[PDB]
A paper describes a structure:
The unc-51-like kinase protein kinase complex (ULK1C) and the class III phosphatidylinositol (PI) 3-kinase complex I (PI3KC3-C1) are the most upstream and central players in the initiation of macroautophagy. FIP200 is the central scaffolding subunit of the ULK1 complex (ULK1C), which also contains the ULK1 (or ULK2) kinase itself, ATG13, and ATG101. The two complexes coassemble through extensive contacts between the FIP200 scaffold subunit of ULK1C and the VPS15 pseudokinase subunit of PI3KC3-C1.
ULK1C and PI3KC3-C1 were mixed and visualized by cryo-EM ([Fig figs6]). The presence of the ULK1^MIT^-ATG13^MIM^ heterodimer was confirmed on both of the FIP200 shoulders, demonstrating that the stoichiometry of the ULK1 complex is altered by the presence of PI3KC3-C1. The presence of PI3KC3-C1 induces a rearrangement of ULK1C from a FIP200:ATG13:ULK1 2:1:1 to a 2:2:2 stoichiometry by dislocating an ATG13 loop (ATG13^MR^) from an inhibitory site on the dimeric FIP200 scaffold. The presence of an excess of 2:2:2 ULK1C cores relative to ULK1C: PI3KC3-C1 supercomplexes suggests that PI3KC3-C1 acts as an exchange factor to promote the 2:2:2 complex, serving to displace ATG13 from the autoinhibitory site #2. This model suggests that PI3KC3-C1 does not need to remain tightly bound in a supercomplex to ULK1C following activation, but PI3KC3-C1 would be susceptible to phosphorylation by ULK1 ^.
Residue numbers in the entry:
A (entry chain D), E (entry chain C): 840 to 1044
B (entry chain F), F (entry chain E): 462 to 476, 487 to 516
C (entry chain B): 1 to 212, 304 to 597
D (entry chain A): 1 to 212, 304 to 583
Write the structure that this text describes.
């Protein structure tokens, strides 16, 4: 037990959480208002975050692609070892690993189905689509998730709402896990600060 | 307690997208094939 | 010189070594560790006038404190709750034992030497109580530094009270932030149509995007950075609007009121009133020491007994006088009984003051918790207001940009075209000038070779001796030379095809 | 070391300190003047190919006055003259007058001086005879060195005739160009007055202001120099024409002008028949030396004749006290004078031949003096004729007035007019340009200064980031570019 | 030093000679000289010479001023004079200088009249002379000495042996007053050296 | 020498003027008045 497949399942839960953040990004973000707020956002914020926001949806589809690829990459090692059998083989994480693999299949399907029109989308100002230089599909909605966590914690430290450290962990600790994706990089430790905050906040949770 | 850090966590640190996007389909189909192999192993599993 | 802290919050004044004269406040907390948990996380350690410093500071970076100067700690890290250490010193029943010794063990008076020893032993007890009194004086200084720390904390509070007023400024800003929010929504409402204008961005441009189609270069650059949100960032804007709801001000206002109450300080001043009396208590204890010195004189008187015990060569009265001296010293020790009595009484009252101070420090830290937590929270709200301003500003900026950058481009295009026109005109005039300059130089060469053939013309000619200014003859450069690319003209044509903000761009 | 070689010019020996190289050639004249009466202007001699030397500095720079330099020059101390002596030999006649064994024994028994005789006095006589022979050898050598100097003199004469030829080539001009000058100077004398009048006709008020009021321009030209005349060139040209009279055109106006043609050339330069006779003289000297070397000993063989007399030891040696026993030595006892005179014959012959050589040297020195200091006059005169040609050229500069003044006036006026018009138009155009600069560019600059942060970044609204070049909007300079104070109207 | 003796009593003769050096003594390059000269152009030469007939006259007036300035004071001193030269009767030696001095009034008269008559023309010359640097025209004495030596050395041949030696001797005698005008620091010494060369030529003449 | 004379000089050339010596009429009139002594000259001396 506690094998490469198990680590892959943990990182796969993290990937699923990040993919859920992405799913909200897929023209589906909502329920961020919480307490009584500037309800006028009904049209204003709607247009602001929807009317021309397909860049985020594309970032989310590419993120789904990245998730499927990462699942395949972890599998090519873990399953190879399991067939080789260097581990204990005392547990049944294999069916769950298969479920994660099917999830990767679905995620890749989503990425391709999106790409069907995202080809012409990227064709719109393709040179502009280029010159991104630094980029990270995770960060694309990680900024949004961190902003949402910030709103929750603004409600929290002033007690305008209640929740748990895990509420932010769903993305911050998601980044904490699978840290190789944030290990040895320019923006390394992508959620280290939120993780440090959640460490203390665990008690209040 | 957590507010001391909450001060620090204000804004998030930052990080040829078209070219990488164009080149992606190879890695995508590669993921498809690795998934097919994974399905093979799972059926074996 | 440098010295250790008073351990003020409880009060355990002590000195330190020479190293601390320049050892940093970090080294200060190190010394705090050196014999205690006093390295722990804590409310504040402070000097006269109130330091509440931080480890980074060098020794001189903070104000001085010494075995005669004020610097100490007043924080929960020692005795987060009331923790009155009791009387370390010995009780005085040995004197009560000595009371018996004088009352009865002075028996067999013929042993004058042993009786004197008893008196000396009584004198021993005298000096002993003298030490006790000194310790009492220590307790006095303890009360001193105690009030000192109380004041230091007070200082902090005022600094917090200063921070409180800073939060108040925020509040005025926050209400202004509430007030400015009146049109900020309209500003966001306008930002809706502004992002609409960003849509249908300049269909062409100088060099299109120039690499630094439906992907609006407006919205494109609106994605030109990693972690922010385009089209006024309304998902965050309404969120912060909630983060600054009137209810927050009300909870914030209540926090402010409590902070004012957190400074009520009624106990502190009232304790001082007792301390003022307890200061007079110190005076009385000083008088106690005075009587102690009186007891010393008694020992000085008692010394005379052992003296006259030797080489007197007189009658038995001298042996009797010691018995009389024994009674005298006995009454002396009775006064001393009242003395040590009020002494320990003072010690008790001292502990009591320490306890009142314990309650004090409790409430003080509570504010230093309740307020200070709320205080930093207010600081956060302040930065949040700064955001509520700056982000809205940027939103309005991009809004104008829907007009601004477009009109700027149109103006640049018209200027570049007319600049080409004017450059052609200026160059043509420059060419005509070069032609006339060549004409002048031709006159120069012809009539100068003729002048080389003239008649002693140095005095006999002038005028054509040189030629008029042919300087500034090379043709001009290009007006608006380095301009962004000419497809800006195509952008100007395309303005109609993207009429979202047509008038302003025109 | 000092030169054992003597002075050819005098054909005689002398001496001086070897460090004389620093002494000047004129200092060399002072040295040869303290005695022998040289002078700083003593002879027509020159250095190298007929020209003066750099005598001022150390004469060593001109290779004169050196330790290896005995006296040699035109030899003006005597006009082909000297005092050639001959060998005195009466001393030998005294020896011949007493040519016998001495009377110190006075016909005693022959044991008297049986190991001694008059050989030494005979030896003294013969050795002195050989001494006179070598003396004649040296004297002949002196005459030969004199011949070498005479050759050097003829060479200097050739160099002089070369200088003469150069001066004549000048004179060819100082005839042909002078003949050509027969027209130029006359015209230079002719039109200069008309030019001066034309110049004075319109003396500019600018010229009146020039020295900063009327005045005569030609005189203003004339008095421009203190000694200059408003027809100074014309006067000099007419004067040169006067000095161009036919007697100057004579083929030997300077008598040298044909003296060099005839004497120093044209088969009259006898130097062609010079050197070989000097060689013939050296041959005569060598033959004399061949005859006279070791000859006194050849006659007086005392060394062997001593033992000869010893072997003789005549039992009747009475007649042997006379020349009969002393044979050829006794012959020498009277022939020494004859040999001395024979040597003196060739010696004085050499001296007289040198006199004849110096005579022909003076014969050429005739045409020499005709040239040096006589035709050299015509030489400087031709230099003057060249100066006169330059004066005619200047006269043309005076002739340059009639058109030069009008050209200066017209060109300056038209140039000032064009300069004024052009500067005014340039200022006006620069003004219109600055007006455009304001109206469009400065307005845009203000709008852009406002446009600070009009977009979140500079490139976002990139365009018209600056104004046009704005060059050529400043004012032009001053017309006519600060000409001289001569006012064109004051010229007008 | 014979100021009251013969060496100065005859100095009036030298003064008169220097006066003559200009008086009816205008030199010019048109001078013929030599054994003869072609007269075929002598007319134009004299024309060039006399085109400034009064200009040389004015130069002469300036030169004569150099002696006339002192002649005025000599006239002033003609009364009450003191001298002690011997070998004379009834101040005949005094008369020896005074007879020549008796013409000092006419000397001033001529020093004026050599330029005075055409006063209006002199104004234009003065108009020229106003900014024209002055020139003490008496310097032509050095020119006379130079021309004397030049004739004596380089006149056309066939002249006699005496060669106008007295003319060059008189030129050498200029030191008796020809340097009265203005010149540089040692230009008078230079003119004296020219006189010495002319005297050497006279000895050669 | 005559040649030496020409060496000394072969033919060297001749070498605010309205007021540099304008005081001429002054001494002129001075002399015109002073000539009276010689004009009288009752006895030579």
């Amino acid at each position: 037990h506690t094998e490469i497949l198990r680590g892959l399942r943990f990182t796969l839960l993290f990937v699923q959480h990040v993919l859920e953040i992405a799913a909200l990004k897929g023209s589906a973000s909502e329920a961020a208002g919480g307490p009584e707020y500037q309800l006028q956002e009904s049209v204003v914020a709607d247009q602001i975050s929807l009317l021309s926001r397909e860049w985020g949806f594309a970032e989310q589809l590419v993120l789904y692609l990245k998730v499927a690829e990462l699942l395949s990459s972890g599998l090519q090692s873990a399953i190879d070892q399991i067939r080789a059998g260097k581990l204990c083989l005392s547990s049944t994480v294999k069916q769950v690993v298969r479920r994660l693999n099917e999830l990767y299949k679905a995620s890749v399907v989503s990425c391709q189905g999106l790409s069907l029109r995202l080809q012409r989308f990227f064709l719109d100002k393709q040179r502009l689509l280029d010159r991104i230089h630094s980029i990270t599909a995770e960060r694309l909605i990680f900024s949004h998730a961190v902003q949402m966590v910030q709103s929750a914690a603004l409600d929290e430290m002033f007690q305008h709402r209640e929740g748990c450290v895990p509420r932010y962990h769903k993305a911050l600790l998601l980044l904490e896990g699978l840290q190789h994706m944030l290990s040895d990089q320019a923006d390394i430790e992508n959620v280290t600060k939120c993780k440090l905050c959640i460490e203390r906040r665990l008690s209040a949770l | 307690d957590l507010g001391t850090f909450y001060r620090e966590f204000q804004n998030p640190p930052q990080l040829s997208m078209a070219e990488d996007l164009d080149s992606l389909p190879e890695k995508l189909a590669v993921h498809e094939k690795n998934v097919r192999e994974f399905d093979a192993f799972v059926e074996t599993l | 010189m440098k010295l250790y802290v008073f351990l003020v919050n409880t009060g355990t004044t002590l000195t330190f070594d020479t190293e601390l004269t320049v050892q940093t406040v970090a080294d200060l907390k190190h010394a705090i560790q050196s014999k205690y948990k006093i390295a722990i996380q804590h409310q504040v350690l402070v000097v006269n006038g109130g330091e509440c410093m931080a480890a980074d500071r060098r020794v001189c970076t903070y104000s001085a404190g010494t075995d005669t100067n004020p610097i100490f700690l007043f924080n929960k890290e020692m005795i987060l709750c009331d923790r009155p250490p009791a009387i370390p010193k010995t009780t005085f029943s040995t004197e009560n034992d000595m009371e018996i010794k004088v009352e009865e063990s002075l028996m067999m008076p013929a042993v004058f030497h042993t009786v004197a020893s008893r008196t000396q032993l009584a004198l021993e007890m005298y000096e002993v109580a003298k030490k006790l009194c000194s310790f009492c004086e220590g307790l006095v200084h303890d009360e001193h530094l105690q009030h000192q720390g109380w004041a230091a904390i007070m200082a902090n509070l005022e600094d917090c009270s200063n921070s409180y007023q800073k939060l108040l400024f925020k509040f005025e800003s926050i209400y202004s932030n509430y007030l400015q929010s009146i049109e900020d929504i309209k500003l966001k409402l306008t930002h809706l149509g502004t992002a609409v204008s960003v849509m249908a961005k300049i269909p062409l441009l100088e060099c299109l995007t120039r690499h630094s189609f439906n992907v609006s270069l407006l919205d494109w650059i609106n994605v030109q950075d990693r972690p922010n949100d385009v089209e006024s960032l309304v998902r965050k804007c309404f969120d912060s609007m909630s983060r600054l709801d009137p209810r927050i001000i009300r909870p914030f206002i209540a926090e402010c009121r409590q902070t004012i109450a957190k400074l009520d300080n009624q106990n502190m001043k009232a304790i001082k009133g007792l301390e003022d009396r307890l200061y007079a208590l110190d005076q009385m204890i000083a008088s106690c020491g005075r009587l102690v010195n009186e007891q010393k004189e008694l020992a000085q008187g008692f010394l005379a007994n052992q003296k006259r015990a030797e080489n007197l060569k007189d009658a038995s009265v001298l042996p009797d006088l010691c018995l009389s001296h024994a009674n005298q010293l006995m009454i002396m020790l009775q006064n001393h009984r009242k003395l040590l009595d009020i002494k320990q009484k003072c010690t008790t009252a001292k502990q009591e003051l320490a306890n009142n101070l314990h309650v004090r420090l409790k409430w003080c830290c509570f504010v230093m918790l309740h307020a200070d937590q709320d205080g930093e929270k207010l600081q956060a709200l302040l930065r949040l207001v700064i955001e509520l301003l700056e982000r809205v500003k940027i939103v309005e900026a991009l809004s104008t940009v829907p007009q601004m950058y477009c009109l700027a481009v149109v103006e640049v295009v018209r200027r570049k075209m007319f600049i080409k026109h004017y450059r052609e005109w200026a160059g043509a005039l420059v060419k005509d000038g070069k032609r006339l300059y060549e004409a002048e130089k031709s006159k120069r060469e012809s009539f100068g070779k003729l002048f080389r053939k003239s008649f002693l013309r140095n005095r006999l000619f002038r005028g054509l001796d040189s030629w008029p200014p042919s300087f500034c003859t090379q043709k001009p450069r290009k007006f608006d030379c380095e301009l962004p690319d000419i497809s800006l003209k195509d952008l100007q044509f395309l303005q109609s095809f993207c009429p979202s903000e047509v008038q302003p761009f025109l």
